[PDB]
Structure formats: C-alpha cells, structure tokens
C-alpha cells in the first residue's frame, strides 16, 4: 500500500519508512511476488515509504506506488512501465565454443 | 470492510487520509430527506374592545 518516493536528505517526514541500502521489501511487481533490495541510493536523497496517511513533502518524486483496494484479500501491487523503471536482463554472452584442435593429414 | 449483497449506501464519505480536518459527507437533494419543523405561528391572542354607542 501507500507509495515509494525520492526526496533531498534531510528531516524524514514524521510517519514514512525509511528505505535506506540493505532494506529488503516483500512486493508484487506486475503480478510477481518479488524482493527488493536497496543498493546505492543516490547522494543527497533519500527514499522512504509513505503510506497514505503520511503526506509527502516537497520535491518529491514518486518512483512507484500502489492503487488503492482495501477490500481486496490479494493485492494487486504495482505497474512498472516502460520508462518508470529500468530493469536490466544480463546480457549472458555465450562465448566460442572450445574446439579441439584437428591436426591435419597430407 | 466489503459490503454484502442488496445493500444500499445511505450515506458515503470521500477517501483523504492526509486531511487533518476532514470533510465529512455532501447529503445531496433526495439523498435525505431533513424536514424543518413548521413552526406555525398561531393567531395572535387580542383583547376583546368593549363597544361605545
């Protein structure tokens, strides 16, 4: 529930959960039951969950948030479009495949 | 809390959690029907003039 959002460092609004690196989050993404693991947030900012009780602050962005269903039993979770997060698929390039040597024959 | 089957909503209020001094409710016309008391106002009470011939 709620939403996830960047603001500059500083005071944390009273009511938001930090999300600070290490800080692992349980979510649904696109219908998948995932874990998110904080790494190198960016200098100067700070990322924090904010229910809906909690108002944000100013210069904030949200990078991704929930719809509201409060009746439903199994959340839905998030969308992340194209462009709202860049998730990278390693590229894995099969390398040459090792061949042995055929000496020749005259 | 999921309402049950043939319920009516009588009366609703709007979602604003980050409101710290709420709204409340907007009964629209034929939502409720408040009735005023009539308050009639009744004759007023006159003493009777004694007649002079």
Redesign the interface.
Known sequence: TGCVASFPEGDVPPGAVECLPGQVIRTKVNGEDVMLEIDEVDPGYQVCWFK????LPENAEILWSYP?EP?AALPTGTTWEEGQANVLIPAEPTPEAAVWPPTPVT
Not at 52 to 55: L, N, S, W
């Open positions: 809906p009780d909690v108002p509201y009746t």
